[PDB]
Amino acid sequence: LKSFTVEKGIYQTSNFRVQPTESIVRFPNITNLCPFGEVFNATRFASVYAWNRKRISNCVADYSVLYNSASFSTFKCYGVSPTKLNDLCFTNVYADSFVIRGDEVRQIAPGQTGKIADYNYKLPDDFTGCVIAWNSNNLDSKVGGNYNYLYRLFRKSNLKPFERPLQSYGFQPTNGVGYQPYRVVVLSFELLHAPATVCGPKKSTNLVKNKCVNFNFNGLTGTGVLTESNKKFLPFQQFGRDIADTTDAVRDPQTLEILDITPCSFGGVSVITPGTNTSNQVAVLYQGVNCTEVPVAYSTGSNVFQTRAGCLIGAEHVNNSYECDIPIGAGICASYQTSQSIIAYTMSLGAENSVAYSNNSIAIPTNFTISVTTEILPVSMTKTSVDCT
Amino acid sequence: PAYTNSFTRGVYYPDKVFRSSVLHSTQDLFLPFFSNVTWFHAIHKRFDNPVLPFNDGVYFASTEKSNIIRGWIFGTTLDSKTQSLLIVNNATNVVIKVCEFQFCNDPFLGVYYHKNNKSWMESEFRVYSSANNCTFEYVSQPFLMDLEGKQGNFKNLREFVFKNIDGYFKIYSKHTPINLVRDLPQGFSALEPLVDLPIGINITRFQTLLALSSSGWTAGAAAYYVGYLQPRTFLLKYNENGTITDAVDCALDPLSETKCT
Amino acid sequence: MYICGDSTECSNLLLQYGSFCTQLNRALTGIAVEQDKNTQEVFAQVKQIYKTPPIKDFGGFNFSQILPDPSKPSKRSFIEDLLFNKVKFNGLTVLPPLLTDEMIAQYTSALLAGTITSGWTFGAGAALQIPFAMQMAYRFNGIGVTQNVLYENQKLIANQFNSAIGKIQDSLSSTASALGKLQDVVNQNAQALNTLVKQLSSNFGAISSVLNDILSRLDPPEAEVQIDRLITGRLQSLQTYVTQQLIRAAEIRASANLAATKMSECVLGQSKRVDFCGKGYHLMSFPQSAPHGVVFLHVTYVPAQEKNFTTAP
Amino acid sequence: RLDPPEAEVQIDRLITGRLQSLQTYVTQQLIRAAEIRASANLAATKMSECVLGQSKRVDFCGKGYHLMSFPQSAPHGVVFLHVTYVPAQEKNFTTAP
Amino acid sequence: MYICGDSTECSNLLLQYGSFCTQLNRALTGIAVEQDKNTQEVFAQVKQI
Ligand SMILES: *[C@@H]1O[C@H](CO)[C@@H](O[C@@H]2O[C@H](CO)[C@@H](O[C@@H]3O[C@H](CO[C@H]4O[C@H](CO)[C@@H](O)[C@H](O)[C@@H]4O)[C@@H](O)[C@H](O)[C@@H]3O)[C@H](O)[C@H]2NC(C)=O)[C@H](O)[C@H]1NC(C)=O
Ligand SMILES: *[C@@H]1O[C@H](CO)[C@@H](O[C@@H]2O[C@H](CO)[C@@H](O[C@@H]3O[C@H](CO)[C@@H](O)[C@H](O)[C@@H]3O)[C@H](O)[C@H]2NC(C)=O)[C@H](O)[C@H]1NC(C)=O
Ligand SMILES: *[C@@H]1O[C@H](CO)[C@@H](O[C@@H]2O[C@H](CO)[C@@H](O[C@@H]3O[C@H](CO)[C@@H](O)[C@H](O)[C@@H]3O)[C@H](O)[C@H]2NC(C)=O)[C@H](O)[C@H]1NC(C)=O
Ligand SMILES: *[C@@H]1O[C@H](CO)[C@@H](O[C@@H]2O[C@H](CO)[C@@H](O[C@@H]3O[C@H](CO)[C@@H](O)[C@H](O)[C@@H]3O)[C@H](O)[C@H]2NC(C)=O)[C@H](O)[C@H]1NC(C)=O
Ligand SMILES: *[C@@H]1O[C@H](CO)[C@@H](O[C@@H]2O[C@H](CO)[C@@H](O[C@@H]3O[C@H](CO)[C@@H](O)[C@H](O)[C@@H]3O)[C@H](O)[C@H]2NC(C)=O)[C@H](O)[C@H]1NC(C)=O
Ligand SMILES: *[C@@H]1O[C@H](CO[C@@H]2O[C@@H](C)[C@@H](O)[C@@H](O)[C@@H]2O)[C@@H](O[C@@H]2O[C@H](CO)[C@@H](O)[C@H](O)[C@H]2NC(C)=O)[C@H](O)[C@H]1NC(C)=O
Ligand SMILES: *[C@@H]1O[C@H](CO)[C@@H](O[C@@H]2O[C@H](CO)[C@@H](O)[C@H](O)[C@H]2NC(C)=O)[C@H](O)[C@H]1NC(C)=O
Ligand SMILES: *[C@@H]1O[C@H](CO)[C@@H](O[C@@H]2O[C@H](CO)[C@@H](O)[C@H](O)[C@H]2NC(C)=O)[C@H](O)[C@H]1NC(C)=O
Ligand SMILES: *[C@@H]1O[C@H](CO)[C@@H](O)[C@H](O)[C@H]1NC(C)=O
Ligand SMILES: *[C@@H]1O[C@H](CO)[C@@H](O)[C@H](O)[C@H]1NC(C)=O
Ligand SMILES: *[C@@H]1O[C@H](CO)[C@@H](O)[C@H](O)[C@H]1NC(C)=O
Ligand SMILES: *[C@@H]1O[C@H](CO)[C@@H](O)[C@H](O)[C@H]1NC(C)=O
Ligand SMILES: *[C@@H]1O[C@H](CO)[C@@H](O)[C@H](O)[C@H]1NC(C)=O
Ligand SMILES: *[C@@H]1O[C@H](CO)[C@@H](O)[C@H](O)[C@H]1NC(C)=O
Ligand SMILES: *[C@@H]1O[C@H](CO)[C@@H](O)[C@H](O)[C@H]1NC(C)=O
C-alpha cells in the first residue's frame, strides 16, 4: 500500500505457487544399436584407395563405449564436444576405413602442408570431424608385413577433390614409434541435407506419481503432477489435448500407459486486518488452496478453518451469527471482537419474524414519527487536459 | 475410363493426438468430396499399365484377391540415375528395398495362374535384371495385409492413400469390408497411419505393378481408382473413443461453408 | 504467470514495462466488487425475514406453486427449480459470489411472504396483517374500480388466477427460448475466456510460440528479440480482454439498476406508470430467483367484452 | 551520447511506450465520464421529481411516505434531505368486509 | 481488405496475429443488430394499424 497505516479491510498481496520437487525424463529405451563391434573388429581393412563409406541409420550411434573404453588415448572434437553431444543430433554418419602411415597423424590435419595429404586422400580445410586414434598395432600387424598397401601413388598431376612412394616395409607388431598402424574412424556428418535420424542414446529415470515435478516425454516439456488415467488412446496416438488446445494426457514411451497431467496448485494470497488503531493482529487467506496440506511442512498455527473460499489461518471459528464486517466469500465474514481476537462466522440475514396473519384481523397505527434522511450523489469530476506532444 | 465420383472416401488421421467429442478443424491435403476419379481397367492383347503422375498424393483402392497388385514403383527419372522405391511382395513378408534398380522399358510380370485351366504357371520371371547401384534399404515389420484368396466374393476394400513431404513418405490404409459386389457403396471410414518411411528421396512419377499367357484371354475383371489430393479445410467429428466419425468439406456449398464457420 | 509462465528471463524483460499488471489487477478487482454490490442492492431490501403462517387460507387463491417447499432438501420453489434446471489451469481464477443460492432463496421467500401477508405496509414501516380479499379490494379501488366488483366475483377471479399460474408453469416447462438473456450472458463470458486462452498459441511474428523452445534453440540476442515480440503480443491481448470486460460490466450495472427499481416500485407497492410493471392495469407482482438474474410475475387486469352506447356530456 | 542515426531506435521505443500509456489513460477517462454522466442524469431527475413536487413512487425519494425534500450543495456533488412520514405504533382489532 | 487488401504475402503474414479480425467483425455486427433492435422497440408498440 506504500503507507505506514492501513484501514480496516481485506487487501491483496503477493501470489502463491508450489515449486516442482525435481525433474523426470523418460524415453523409449533403445534396442536398436549399430554394429560398432563388428565395425571396429574387422580382421583386415580394405585398400587405402578403396576406403569404404558406410551410411549409418535406423540404429543408435552410441558413443558411451568410446568414452567408457580406455583403449583410446587421443580423441579430439574440433566442431563439437562430448558434453553437448548428448543433446546434439547428426543427420547421418559415414564410417570410413583406410590404412595410413603412422607418421601421417601430423599431416592428416585439415589445411596442413604436405602434398602427400592430397596425393593419398585430400581433406577439406574445414574438416572438423572428430578423429579417433587407438593403438591397434598387434591387431592390424602381420608377422611378415602388409605389402598390399602400396603407396606409389606419386603421380605428378594433382587430383582435384572428388572430380567425379613405397616407404612401407611392412606392418608388424615390432614396429617402432610413429610407424605402428593405427585404426582411424572418420566422423563425417552434414546439415540441411536429410531429416535427422542418428543420435546418441538418452538416459531415463524412474517414473513418479503424486508429486509436482518437471517432466520431459519425447521432447514434450512441462510441469505438473503425474497420475494414472482411464483414457483409452488409440494404438498410434501419443498425446491428449483439451478443447482449449492444452496438453492433458500423455503416454509413457517405455510402459504403454496413459497418464494424466494436472497443473500444480496455486492461488492468490490476501491479508485481513482491522484498522491499525485497534491492533496489528492479522489473518491470511489462501485463495482456492487446499488447507490441510500446507501446514504439513505463525509457525505454531493451531488455527486452520477450511472454507469454500480456501484455507484460512489466524482466526477462530465461532458458530454464532452476526452482520458482515469484512466479507470473505461464500457467505463467510470476519470481524474483531473480545480476550481480543479475530473470528470468522456465517453472516446473518436479519432477525427472524412471524406475522400473526389471520382472516378476520387487521392492525392500524395509532400515531406517527417524521423522519429525515440524506442521500449523496456525485455530479461531476475535475476537468483535465493533456498536451500530447 | 469411367469417371466415378467418390462420395466420402479419402479421410485420414492428420496427426497422432487424442481428442474426444471435439469438432477440431484442420488445414491439410485432402481428397475433395464428390470428385470424379478414374476407373482403370486392370487387364493385362489389350495392356493397360501406364505411368501416372504423382501430385501430392494418390487415393488408391481396389477389390482384388490373392495380391494381384504386387507392388508400386515411385521415382522421378526411373533410369537408374535416381534411387526408386520398390515394394514387391510375396510369401513370407514385405521386402521393401529402395535402390537404383535397372528398369526395363516394359517391366511387367503378367502371369496367368489359376485363371482358365486352374494351374499356376510363370512363363517368364525376368522382372529383375541387375541391382547395379543401391544406397538404402529398410524392410518394415514383416507382415502382409489381407491380400490373400478372396474368390468366394469381393468382400474387401483395400483403401490406400499415399503422401510424401519433407523427405518422409507416409502410407495410410486399412481393411474395409464390403457387402455388395456393385460399384463402391456409399459409406464412411477413416484411414489410420499404417507405416512411415524416412526415405528422403524425390518422387514425381509413379508406376504400379500388375500380375493380371495371351492364349484364350478375355478382359479380366479387375480395376483400381486413382484420385488426387488438394489443399482444403475440413471439419472432423471425434467420438468418445477418439475415432473420427464424420466430416464436412468447407469449400463445397454454402450450407457446408456455414457449418464450417 | 500468464504472460511469462515459468521464465525468469521473461519476468526480467517484463519488469521494463512494469505497472501494467498492477493496473489490470486493480481494474478487475473493481469489477469483482461491483458484482457483489449489484446483487446486494437488488435483493437485500428487507430488514427482517418474515415467514408464511402454517395455514394457507388466502381467500381461495393458491400460491403453492411459488412458495418454498420444505420437503425438498433444497429450499426452493417449483418455478425456481424449473428455471435452475432450464439454464483455473492457466492463471485464471473465478471467485465465488458472496451470497449463496440458499441466501438468495431465503431473501426471495421473505419478500414473497411479507407481500402476501401484509400488502405494501411492510415496505414503508412495520408489517401489518390484512386479509387477502381486503388487499385485493384495495388494489381494485386503486386502479379505478369499485370494490363490490371483487366482492361479488371473488370465486371467478380466484379460478382465473389459478389457471393463469398453471399455464405459465406449463409454458416454462415446455419452451426453452425464454432465458435467452441469461444464456447469452453465460455464453459470452465463456467465449471471452476461451478466446483469451487460445491467444497463447500465436507466433505474433516470432519463430515459435514455445518460450522454452526458443530459449533452447536460439542464442542470447535473437532469443530476447523473440521473447520481446511474444511479450508485446500477449500484453496487447490482455489489454483488449480487460477493456471488453469493463464495457460489459457497465452494461450489466445498468441492467441491475433497472431491476432494483422495478423491484422497489412493483413488488413493494402499486405503480401508475404505464407498461412499467407489465401490460395492462397493474395489480401486484411476485419475484423469483434465477441463476445470475431475477424473474418477475406481473399480475394485471384487462377489460374483455365491450358494447355500444350513446353519450351526452 | 549517441549519433543521429542510432538514437532513432531508442527514441522510437520511448515514443511507443508513452503513446500506449496515453491511450490507456484516455480510454479509462472516457468510461469513467460515461458513468458519472449517468449518475448526473439520475440526480437531475431526483431533483425535478422530489424537490419541485411530491412523488408517489415508492422508495424513490426517501424511505416511507414522502412529504418534501431540500437540496444542499457539496464538493463535486449534491445532497438531499428527504422528509418522510412513518406510522409508528400499531393496535389490533377485528375486521369484516 | 482494409489492412493489406489484395496481397497474399501480407495475408499470410497477418495470419500469425490470431483472431483479431474475427473479434472486430463480431463487435461491429453486434452494434449493427443493436441499432435495428433499438428502432423496433422504440416504435413498434402497437400491433394493429
Ligand atoms: C394448489 O394448486 C396445486 C397445483 O395442483 C395443487 O397441488 C396439487 O394439485 C393436485 C391436483 O389439484 C392435488 O391432487 C393430486 O395431486 C397428485 C400429485 O400432487 C401434485 O398435483 C399436481 C398435479 O399432479 C402437481 O402440479 C402438484 O405440484 C402436486 O405435486 C396427483 O396424483 C394428482 O394430480 C391429484 O390430483 C395434489 O394434492 C396437490 N399436490 C401438492 C400440493 O403437493 C394444490 O392441491 C392446490 N391447493 C389446494 C387445492 O388447496
Ligand atoms: C524398455 O522398457 C519396457 C517397459 O516399459 C520393457 O518392457 C518390459 O520388460 C519387462 C522385462 O521383460 C517386463 O516385465 C517383466 O517381463 C517378463 C518377461 O518375461 C515377465 O515374465 C515378468 O512377469 C514381467 O512382466 C514388462 O512386462 C515389459 N513391459 C513393457 C510395456 O514393455 C522393454 O523390455 C524395454 N525395452 C524396449 C521397450 O525396447
Ligand atoms: C376465517 O376462517 C374460517 C375458515 O374458513 C371460516 O370459518 C371457519 O369454518 C370452520 C367450519 O365451520 C370452523 O371450524 C369448526 O367447524 C366445526 C364443524 O363441526 C364447528 O363445530 C366449530 O364451531 C368451528 O366452526 C372454523 O372455526 C371457522 N373459523 C373462523 C375464523 O370463522 C371463517 O368464515 C373465515 N372468516 C373470514 C372473514 O375469513
Ligand atoms: C469406446 O467405444 C464403445 C462403443 O463405441 C463405447 O462403449 C463400448 O460399447 C461396447 C459394445 O459392446 C462395449 O463392449 C462390451 O461388450 C460386452 C459383451 O461382449 C458387454 O458386457 C459390455 O457391457 C460392453 O457392452 C464396451 O465395453 C463399451 N466400452 C468400450 C471402451 O468399448 C465406449 O464408451 C468407448 N470408450 C471410450 C473411452 O471412448
Ligand atoms: C392482533 O395483532 C397482534 C399483533 O401480534 C396480536 O396480539 C398478539 O401478538 C402476538 C405477536 O406479536 C401473538 O403471539 C404472541 O406473541 C409472540 C409472537 O406470536 C409469542 O410469544 C406468541 O406467539 C404469543 O402468542 C399473540 O398471539 C397475539 N395475542 C392474541 C391473538 O390474543 C394478535 O395477532 C392479534 N390479536 C389481538 C387481541 O391483538
Ligand atoms: C360498437 O360500434 C361499432 C359501430 O357503431 C355501432 O355498432 C353497433 C354495435 C351499433 O351500436 C350501431 O348502431 C353502430 O353502427 C361496431 O362496429 C360496427 O359493426 C357493424 C358491422 O360491422 C356496423 O355497425 C359497422 O360495419 C361497424 N362499424 C364500422 C364499419 O365503422 C362495433 O362492432 C360495436 N362493438 C361491439 C362489441 O359490438
Ligand atoms: C570387438 O572387440 C572388442 C575387444 O576390445 C570387444 O570389446 C571388449 O574389449 C575389451 C578390451 O579390454 C575386453 O577386455 C572385452 O573382453 C571385450 N568384449 C568382448 C570380447 O565381448 C567387443 O565386444 C567386440 N565387439 C563385437 C564382437 O561385436
Ligand atoms: C403518540 O402519542 C403520544 C402522546 O403524546 C406521544 O407521546 C409524547 O411525545 C412527545 C414528543 O414530543 C413527548 O414530549 C411526550 O413526553 C410524550 N408523552 C406524552 C405527551 O404524554 C408520542 O410521541 C406519539 N408517538 C408517535 C410515534 O406518534
Ligand atoms: C484511529 O481513529 C480515528 C478517529 O476515529 C482516525 O482519525 C485515525 O486515522 C485512526 N488511526 C489509525 C492508525 O487507525
Ligand atoms: C457450532 O455448533 C456445534 C456445537 O457443538 C459444533 O458443530 C461446533 O461447535 C459449531 N459448528 C462448527 C462448524 O464449528
Ligand atoms: C467427372 O467427369 C465426368 C465425365 O462427364 C462428369 O460427368 C462428372 O460430372 C465429373 N465430376 C465433377 C465433380 O465434375
Ligand atoms: C519376393 O520376390 C523375390 C524373390 O523371388 C524377392 O523380392 C523376395 O525374396 C520375395 N519376398 C519374400 C518375402 O521372400
Ligand atoms: C491351359 O492349361 C495349361 C496347363 O496348366 C496352361 O499352361 C495354360 O495357360 C492354360 N490355358 C489358359 C488360356 O489359361
Ligand atoms: C550410385 O553411383 C555410384 C556408382 O559407383 C556410387 O556413388 C554409388 O554406387 C551410388 N551413389 C551413392 C551411394 O551415393
Ligand atoms: C528432388 O529431391 C531432392 C532431395 O532428395 C531435392 O534436392 C529436391 O527436392 C529435388 N532435387 C533437386 C535437384 O531439386
Sign (positive or negative) of CA dihedral B187, B193, B196, B201: positive
- Matching residue, cell 492463471: C91
Determine contact: C194 vs chain A, CB below 8 A: yes
Sheet holding B244-249, edge to edge: B23-30, B230-238, B244-249
Strands (E), B68-151: 72-75, 85-86, 89-90, 93-94
Give the integer Cα–Cα distance in Å for A207 and A255.
10
Here the cell at position A46 is 580394405
Inter-chain CB proximity A330 and C100 less than 8 Å: yes
Amino acid at A130: C
Give the integer Cα–Cα distance in Å for C119 and C100.
28
β-strand A341-347 against A23-26: which pairing, if any? unpaired
Which of C28, C39, C46, C95 to probe the A interface (max A CBs under 10 A)?
C95
Give the integer Cα–Cα distance in Å for A380 and D75.
9
Determine contact: A243 vs chain B, CB below 8 A: yes
CB D9 within 8 A of CB C225: no
- Residue A331 burial (10 A CB sphere; 0-12, 13-18, 19+): buried
Q: What is the DSSP letter of C107?
A: H
- CA A276–ligand 9 middle distance (angstroms): 8
Give the integer Cα–Cα distance in Å for A277 and E1.
63
| CA D17 centroid distance within chain | 33
- Matching residue, cell 463445397: B252
Other C-beta atoms within 10 Å of A388: how many?
A: 7
Burial annotation A198-223 (CB, 10 A radius, 16+ → b, else e) = bbbebeeeeeeeeebbbbebeeeebb
Here the cell at position D69 is 425534500
Strands (E), B40-191: 52-53, 58-62, 72-75, 85-86, 89-90, 93-94, 158-165, 168-175
How far, in Å, are A218, A220, A251, A256, E37 from residue A26 at the CA level?
A: 7, 10, 10, 12, 60
Chain C residues inside the 8 Å CB shell of A287: 93, 95
Give the integer Cα–Cα distance in Å for B69 and B226.
14
Q: What is the DSSP letter of E47?
A: S
CB C132 within 8 A of CB C116: yes
Cβ-nearest to D87 among C125, C250, C264? C125
Burial annotation C53-67 (CB, 10 A radius, 16+ → b, else e) = beeeebbebebeebb
Burial annotation C255-273 (CB, 10 A radius, 16+ → b, else e) = ebeebbbbbbbbbbbbbee
Start-to-end Cα distance in chain D: 98
- CA C275–ligand 6 middle distance (angstroms): 29
Report the residue count for chain E: 49
Minimal-distance CA residue to ligand 3 atom 28: A359
CB D79 within 8 A of CB D73: yes
Determine contact: E16 vs chain C, CB below 8 A: yes
Neighbours of chain A (3+ CB pairs under 8 A): B, C, D
Give the integer Cα–Cα distance in Å for A259 and A103.
59
Neighbours of chain C (3+ CB pairs under 8 A): A, D, E
CB B89 within 8 A of CB B144: yes
Q: What ranges in chain C are assigned the alpha helix state H?
A: 8-14, 20-43, 78-86, 101-118, 121-124, 132-143, 147-174, 180-198, 211-217, 222-262
Q: What is the DSSP letter of E4?
A: T
3+ Cβ–Cβ pairs closer than 8 Å linking C and D? yes
Inter-chain CB proximity A372 and D83 less than 8 Å: yes
How far, in Å, are A217, A241, B230, C214, C227 from residue A214 at the CA level?
A: 10, 19, 42, 18, 22
Determine contact: A263 vs chain C, CB below 8 A: yes
How far, in Å, are B32, B64, B192, B238, B245 from residue B187 at the CA level?
A: 15, 19, 17, 17, 11
Q: Which atom of ligand 3 is nearest to the CA of C59?
A: 39
> Angle, to 10 degrees, between the axis of helix C222-262 and the axis of helix C20-43?
20
CB A250 within 8 A of CB A220: yes
Give the integer Cα–Cα distance in Å for D78 and D61.
14
| Residue C159 near ligand 1, beta carbon < 6 Å | no
> Which bound ligand lies closest to the C-alpha atom of A69?
7
CB B59 within 8 A of CB B160: yes
CB A363 within 8 A of CB D90: yes
CB A36 within 8 A of CB A65: yes
Give the integer Cα–Cα distance in Å for C273 and C280.
10
> Which bound ligand lies closest to the C-alpha atom of A232?
4
What residue of C is the nearest CA neighbor of D32?
A: C250
> Angle, to 10 degrees, between the axis of helix C132-143 and the axis of helix C147-174?
100
Q: Distance (Å) from the C-alpha of residue B165 to the closest C-alpha of chain A?
A: 11
Q: Which atom of ligand 14 is nearest to the CA of B135?
A: 13
Q: Characterise B236 by phi-psi region: left (phi > 0), alpha (psi -120 to 50), beta (else).
A: beta
DSSP H/E element including B259: helix B254-260
Other C-beta atoms within 10 Å of C2: how many?
A: 15
- Residue B135 burial (10 A CB sphere; 0-12, 13-18, 19+): exposed
Cβ-nearest to C265 among D31, D57, D65? D57
Here the cell at position A120 is 593419398
Pocket test residue of B85, B202, B205 for ligand 15, highest count of atoms within 8 A of CB: B202
Give the integer Cα–Cα distance in Å for C223 and C203.
14
3+ Cβ–Cβ pairs closer than 8 Å linking E and B? no
Inter-chain CB proximity C125 and D64 less than 8 Å: yes
- DSSP output for C118-142: HTTHHHHSS-----HHHHHHHHHHH
Other C-beta atoms within 10 Å of A355: how many?
A: 22
Inter-chain CB proximity E18 and C202 less than 8 Å: yes
Report the residue count for chain A: 389
Chain D residues inside the 8 Å CB shell of A361: 92-95
β-strand A212-217 against A23-26: which pairing, if any? parallel
Q: What is the DSSP letter of C292?
A: T
Give the integer Cα–Cα distance in Å for A172 and A180.
7
| Residue A359 near ligand 3, beta carbon < 6 Å | yes
- CA C307–ligand 6 middle distance (angstroms): 9
> Which bound ligand lies closest to the C-alpha atom of A4?
9
Determine contact: E12 vs chain C, CB below 8 A: no
Q: What's the count of helices (H) and strands (E) in chain B, helices before strands?
A: 1, 17
Neighbours of chain E (3+ CB pairs under 8 A): C
Q: For residue C65, what are the β-bridge partners?
A: none
Burial annotation D16-49 (CB, 10 A radius, 16+ → b, else e) = eeeebeeeeeeeeeeeeeeebeeebeebeebeeb
What method was applied to determine this entry?
cryo-EM
Here the cell at position B174 is 486399412
Q: Measuring CA to CA, which residue among B65, A21, D65, A80 is closest to residue C120?
A: D65
- Matching residue, cell 468430396: B33
Angle ∠(A107,A111,A117) on CA atoms, nearest 5: 40
CB B19 within 8 A of CB B240: no
Burial annotation C7-39 (CB, 10 A radius, 16+ → b, else e) = beebeebbeeeeebeeebeebbeebeeebeebb
Determine contact: B17 vs chain A, CB below 8 A: yes
Determine contact: C212 vs chain A, CB below 8 A: yes
How far, in Å, are A344, B88, B118, B127, B168 from residue B124 at the CA level?
A: 96, 16, 18, 8, 35
Q: How many CA atoms lie within 13 A of B148 on its CB side?
A: 7
CB C221 within 8 A of CB C230: no
Q: Measuring CA to CA, which residue among D7, D3, D25, D27 is closest to residue D15?
A: D7
Amino acid at A10: I
Which of A239, A251, A257 to probe the B interface (max B CBs under 10 A)?
A239
Give the integer Cα–Cα distance in Å for C56 and C75.
18
- CA B125–ligand 14 middle distance (angstroms): 27
Cβ-nearest to C128 among D38, D86, D90? D90
Residues 6+ apart with CB under 8 A from B238: B19, B20, B21, B22, B23, B24, B244, B245
Q: Which atom of ligand 15 is nearest to the CA of B76?
A: 1
- Matching residue, cell 406449463: C170
Give the integer Cα–Cα distance in Å for D17 and C17.
8
Give the integer Cα–Cα distance in Å for B30 and B59.
10
How far, in Å, are A114, A167, A322, C268 from residue A107 at the CA level?
A: 7, 16, 95, 106
- CA B121–ligand 13 middle distance (angstroms): 8
Sheet holding A212-217, edge to edge: A23-26, A212-217, A220-228, A258-262, A247-251, A239-241, B17-18
Inter-chain CB proximity C204 and E16 less than 8 Å: yes
Residues 6+ apart with CB under 8 A from C275: none
- Matching residue, cell 500506449: D20
Determine contact: D38 vs chain C, CB below 8 A: yes
Amino acid at C258: L
| CA C118 centroid distance within chain | 26
Minimal-distance CA residue to ligand 15 atom 1: B202
Q: For residue B61, what are the β-bridge partners?
A: B225
How would you write chain A as a 3-class SS string? Answer: CCCCCCCCEEEEEEEEECCCCCEEEECCCCCCECCHHHHHCCCCCCCHHHCCCEEECCCECCCHHHHHCCCCCEEECCCCCHHHHCCCCECCEEECCCCCCHHHHCCCCCCCCCCHHHHHCCCCCCCCCCEEEEECCCCCCCCCCCCCCCCCCCCCCCCCCCCCCCCCCCCCCCCCCCCCCEEEEECECCCCCCCCCECCCCCCCCCCCCCEEEEEECCEEEEEEEEECCCCCCCCCCEEECCCCCEEEEECCCCCCEEEEECCCEEEEEEEECCCCCCCCCEEEECCCCCCCHHHCCCCCCCECCCCCCCEECCEEEEEEECCCEECCCCCEEEEECCCEEEEEEECCCCECCCCCCCCEEEEEEEEEEEEEEEEEECCCCCCCCCCC
Q: What is the DSSP letter of B248?
A: E
Give the integer Cα–Cα distance in Å for A297 and B23.
45
DSSP H/E element including B143: none
CB D31 within 8 A of CB D46: no
CB A314 within 8 A of CB A269: no
Residues 6+ apart with CB under 8 A from C65: C77, C78, C79, C165, C166, C169
Give the integer Cα–Cα distance in Å for B261 and B233.
11
Strands (E), B80-167: 85-86, 89-90, 93-94, 158-165
| Residue A206 near ligand 8, beta carbon < 6 Å | no
CB B85 within 8 A of CB B169: yes
